[PDB]
Amino acid sequence: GLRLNELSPGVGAKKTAQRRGRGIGSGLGKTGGRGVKGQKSRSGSSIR
Amino acid sequence: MYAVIKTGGKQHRVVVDELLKVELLKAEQGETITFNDVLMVVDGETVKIGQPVVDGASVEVEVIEHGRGEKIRIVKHNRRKHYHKEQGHRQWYTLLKIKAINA
Amino acid sequence: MEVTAKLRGAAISAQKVRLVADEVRGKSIERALDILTYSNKKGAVFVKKCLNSAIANAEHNHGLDIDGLKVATIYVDEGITLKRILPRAKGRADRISKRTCHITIKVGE
Amino acid sequence: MKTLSAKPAEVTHDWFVVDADGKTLGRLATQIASRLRGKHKTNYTPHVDTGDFIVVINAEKIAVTGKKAQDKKYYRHSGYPGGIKETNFTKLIAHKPEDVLHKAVKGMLPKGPLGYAMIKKLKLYAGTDHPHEAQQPKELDI
Amino acid sequence: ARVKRGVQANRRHKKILKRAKGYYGARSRVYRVAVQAVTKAGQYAYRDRRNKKRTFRRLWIARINAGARLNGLSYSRFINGMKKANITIDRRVLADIAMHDAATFGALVEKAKAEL
RNA sequence: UGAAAUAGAACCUGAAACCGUGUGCGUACAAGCAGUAGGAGCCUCAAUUUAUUGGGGUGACUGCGUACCUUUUGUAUAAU
RNA sequence: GGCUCAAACUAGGAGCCGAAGCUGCGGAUUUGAAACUUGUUUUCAAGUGGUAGGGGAGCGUUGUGUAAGCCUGUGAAGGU
């Protein structure tokens, strides 16, 4: 290894995790991918 | 003492040693461009109107510089629809100095 | 030169003092003192006190001729507000603001 | 090169006199409205008054076709409940002769500060004489 | 790794408010009102960037109509005459000549009139 | 006194809302989401041989133009 | 508003206006295509309204290493 500065993970290795509800531009704002009023949009929903 | 020329999809009424900014051209700075398709030359009292081009008449311009214009903010918003987008724009221009209007 | 005096903390609303300050702004020292001594408003005793202190400062600290002075600037700012409680009917309580004012006066030739 | 405006200080309003004798009301009114707006001028800019002063004589002699002299109704509301009032073209010509042509032109001018300023250049008189020989209007058959 | 957001929030709100200068009342003072005022200004500017191209041609056409009627025919017949004469001069330059060079516009009208 | 006192004790820094004072321009015949696109005039700085540009403030007058969110088949909505 | 051999209607004809449609000019970008070939370069073709939603690429913030570094009273952070 050269240095603790120049260590890259090797493109494709990492990905940014998704963050719901952080504005219009991120693609996951407001509802956060959940849709509208319904059971599956709620805070403890699942598929059973 | 003036002419009408076509540059960048637009038309311009030009006089000598006039600084005119037009659309971006593929010419270097200080390079001299000759417009030999002028539309009209009005030299004092003589009016030469080309149909569509005044034959023989020409104007030489000098490419003073190239640059970006004023930044423009483009704002798009769809009310009640969770839609907003912004972007910036700066149009490219060239500055020409009219050198002469050949009849 | 400009000689200042400040009367930070007058127990009165700045709104109630600005009416008095508007009538002495720009006047000469003598005319301003006349207006203040014959005003029926409570803000005038505060403004007169601050003005007299500014004139004293100009005479003593700065050695200026008082006969040629004038109220060059005057403004009233809001001070610290005391907060109190006023009972109302049906077991309800309103907050009361006891406002104070800061008076700044600058005399000058 | 740019497109310049008329620069109000540089604009001149010319005086013209029009004889409204037997002419059609609206056919004359459109011409007058265009002249008051300044549309006949190559310096026309819609935010500047580039018009001309129009002095109309024989305003009580303007004509309407059909049966409009007796059927053209002029309504106004006075601001009071039931306060709707109506008058005829012929009654209004007898009573306030200039108001027929003034009303026709006001309808054809734009509705705003500039339009109010351009209607102020319409000087219309019943009779053959106008008190504006000092301005020397030029006779304009329009 | 607690993040306090005051500094970034301050400069974001300051950006919007600095773009809301000149606006009356709360529209240049309070962010909640100013931010939608700035968005609406942007929307108007976007629409008016098209409508300007729309409005200046209306101005040029009115000026050319005045100029052609000053010596001869109407705007519609003038434009037909230019098209027949193969004169490529645009309405912007035409209105400029009508407003600033009456003799040249007279000669230009004479060409269109000779072509019909 | 202190390096500093708009470090003076409610005392480091001292934002915003909110309230003043001063200067410049506009505003008392004109109807509406208060902007936008144009645009006269005035004021002010810098170059320039001297009103000609450029930057800044203001904005007469003209066109266009019924907030945002949510929820909806659909909202300027007098729906939240 | 106003309009009556219309500025109405019927039947033709010729001009013109008219949109963010199309063309012109300049620029960005998605996909695919011939190559010094990983945006190394020049182009070409077809595209680029968008809610729910799916996919892609980034910005900024706090903290750790890099860092006993680098910057900083010849003025850091913050504020304007």
Side-chain angles (χ1 to χ4, degrees), chain A, chain B, chain C, chain D residues 1-85 87-142, chain E residues 1-89 91-116:
Chain A
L2 299 93
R3 293 288 172 189
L4 294 155
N5 275 11
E6 310 110 343
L7 279 180
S8 178
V11 317
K14 301 297 165 82
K15 268 178 60 105
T16 313
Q18 280 173 11
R19 275 170 326 127
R20 306 191 188 176
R22 285 313 180 274
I24 283 178
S26 66
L28 284 181
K30 188 209 201 161
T31 88
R34 266 171 201 277
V36 309
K37 300 207 279 278
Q39 190 173 7
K40 306 155 50 60
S41 88
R42 305 294 173 191
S43 172
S45 72
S46 51
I47 313 307
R48 184 171 169 175
Chain B
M1 272 63 246
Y2 74 75
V4 185
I5 65 184
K6 277 185 327 184
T7 326
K10 268 78 74 183
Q11 265 159 57
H12 304 281
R13 207 257 298 261
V14 293
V15 296
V16 177
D17 67 39
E18 172 218 86
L19 250 63
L20 159 74
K21 54 207 325 163
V22 298
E23 301 274 352
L24 193 66
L25 293 158
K26 276 164 274 202
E28 278 87 338
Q29 301 81 244
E31 155 157 33
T32 291
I33 312 176
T34 278
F35 291 111
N36 45 15
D37 60 345
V38 315
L39 276 74
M40 174 180 21
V41 167
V42 174
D43 261 352
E45 193 276 334
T46 304
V47 189
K48 308 171 211 46
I49 320 163
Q51 299 173 250
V53 157
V54 185
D55 47 2
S58 84
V59 306
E60 322 65 16
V61 314
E62 193 227 311
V63 178
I64 307 298
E65 97 197 353
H66 309 278
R68 309 278 280 286
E70 176 76 29
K71 168 80 88 175
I72 270 175
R73 297 208 77 121
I74 309 156
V75 171
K76 300 188 186 187
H77 173 71
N78 280 352
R79 82 223 286 210
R80 290 164 332 238
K81 310 261 160 242
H82 201 226
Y83 175 77
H84 188 100
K85 196 176 79 146
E86 295 185 68
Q87 93 171 356
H89 182 76
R90 286 190 85 184
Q91 190 69 13
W92 275 95
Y93 69 89
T94 84
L95 193 50
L96 308 179
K97 180 183 182 70
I98 325 291
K99 281 188 175 179
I101 303 169
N102 321 96
Chain C
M1 63 135 64
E2 205 95 324
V3 177
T4 215
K6 303 180 169 146
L7 205 151
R8 312 201 29 120
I12 184 173
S13 264
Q15 205 193 144
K16 304 200 187 108
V17 187
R18 302 223 178 90
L19 293 175
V20 184
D22 291 351
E23 319 286 335
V24 298
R25 179 177 299 117
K27 317 297 206 224
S28 72
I29 281 322
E30 188 202 347
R31 173 78 186 130
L33 285 185
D34 278 330
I35 294 163
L36 295 175
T37 183
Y38 288 102
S39 175
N40 275 357
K41 292 305 222 156
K42 189 185 97 172
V45 330
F46 283 121
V47 174
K48 190 189 177 163
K49 208 186 262 313
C50 188
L51 183 58
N52 276 327
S53 176
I55 299 153
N57 291 346
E59 205 215 17
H60 184 265
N61 305 329
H62 298 249
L64 293 183
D65 189 6
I66 262 51
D67 203 359
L69 285 172
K70 141 180 133 295
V71 184
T73 101
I74 179 173
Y75 39 80
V76 196
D77 299 334
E78 277 149 6
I80 297 175
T81 286
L82 305 183
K83 323 243 179 104
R84 304 295 177 231
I85 294 299
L86 183 100
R88 308 298 301 240
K90 313 266 197 72
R92 305 201 56 290
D94 299 336
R95 179 111 270 189
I96 288 290
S97 85
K98 287 181 124 303
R99 315 182 171 275
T100 56
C101 76
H102 303 323
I103 303 167
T104 297
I105 300 177
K106 286 161 158 135
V107 300
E109 70 275 14
Chain D
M1 200 213 114
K2 279 222 302 183
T3 302
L4 316 178
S5 299
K7 272 205 179 54
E10 279 179 333
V11 81
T12 289
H13 307 280
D14 304 305
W15 282 76
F16 297 94
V17 56
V18 174
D19 201 338
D21 184 22
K23 294 185 179 179
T24 306
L25 169 59
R27 307 269 176 174
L28 179 74
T30 55
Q31 298 296 62
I32 292 168
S34 284
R35 299 283 194 160
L36 294 173
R37 186 160 207 213
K39 303 204 85 170
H40 59 289
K41 286 181 179 172
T42 56
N43 39 87
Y44 161 86
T45 162
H47 73 89
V48 177
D49 186 15
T50 48
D52 296 325
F53 284 91
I54 302 289
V55 169
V56 179
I57 65 170
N58 295 303
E60 85 298 347
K61 261 152 198 262
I62 201 159
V64 285
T65 63
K67 272 143 98 194
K68 289 149 78 178
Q70 214 67 45
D71 273 14
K72 185 181 190 29
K73 259 78 173 151
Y74 295 93
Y75 289 97
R76 86 189 165 277
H77 205 274
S78 70
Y80 280 78
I84 184 69
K85 300 181 178 293
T87 192
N88 245 338
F89 167 91
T90 175
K91 270 183 280 273
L92 183 66
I93 279 281
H95 173 240
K96 227 169 160 182
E98 315 76 1
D99 267 23
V100 170
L101 194 44
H102 189 271
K103 212 161 291 190
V105 181
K106 175 181 169 231
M108 305 179 183
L109 259 56
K111 290 76 181 166
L114 195 61
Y116 314 145
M118 320 175 306
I119 201 165
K120 213 208 277 191
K121 305 199 314 289
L122 178 61
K123 263 77 180 169
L124 69 173
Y125 304 95
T128 45
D129 303 327
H130 58 82
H132 304 300
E133 328 304 352
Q135 276 68 55
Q136 279 149 347
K138 314 145 261 192
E139 188 53 70
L140 168 73
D141 43 351
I142 202 72
Chain E
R2 180 150 180 269
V3 175
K4 281 228 270 195
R5 33 200 186 95
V7 175
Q8 279 44 73
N10 177 34
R11 52 136 300 265
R12 215 179 34 94
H13 279 202
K14 204 158 73 141
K15 204 199 253 264
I16 294 282
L17 282 159
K18 188 204 125 84
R19 224 180 308 164
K21 307 257 299 301
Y23 292 177
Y24 167 70
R27 305 173 151 266
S28 61
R29 290 158 168 97
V30 336
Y31 170 89
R32 226 177 258 254
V33 177
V35 67
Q36 77 196 35
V38 162
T39 300
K40 177 58 104 152
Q43 301 173 236
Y44 282 150
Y46 178 90
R47 162 213 73 181
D48 279 2
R49 222 168 295 129
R50 286 116 192 90
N51 289 16
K52 176 180 33 172
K53 283 171 263 292
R54 200 180 298 180
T55 295
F56 271 93
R57 194 193 225 251
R58 160 177 301 224
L59 179 62
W60 307 325
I61 288 169
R63 300 215 160 132
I64 298 159
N65 206 344
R69 275 173 205 270
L70 253 165
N71 46 14
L73 66 182
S74 51
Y75 168 93
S76 175
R77 308 208 74 237
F78 180 64
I79 292 302
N80 196 25
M82 305 269 88
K83 197 237 209 204
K84 288 152 114 83
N86 254 275
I87 288 163
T88 309
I89 298 165
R91 286 156 186 78
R92 187 171 97 96
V93 176
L94 278 173
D96 193 65
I97 297 156
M99 192 184 189
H100 301 324
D101 206 336
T104 297
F105 199 82
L108 209 36
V109 169
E110 288 327 292
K111 197 86 73 223
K113 168 146 28 154
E115 289 280 20
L116 51 87

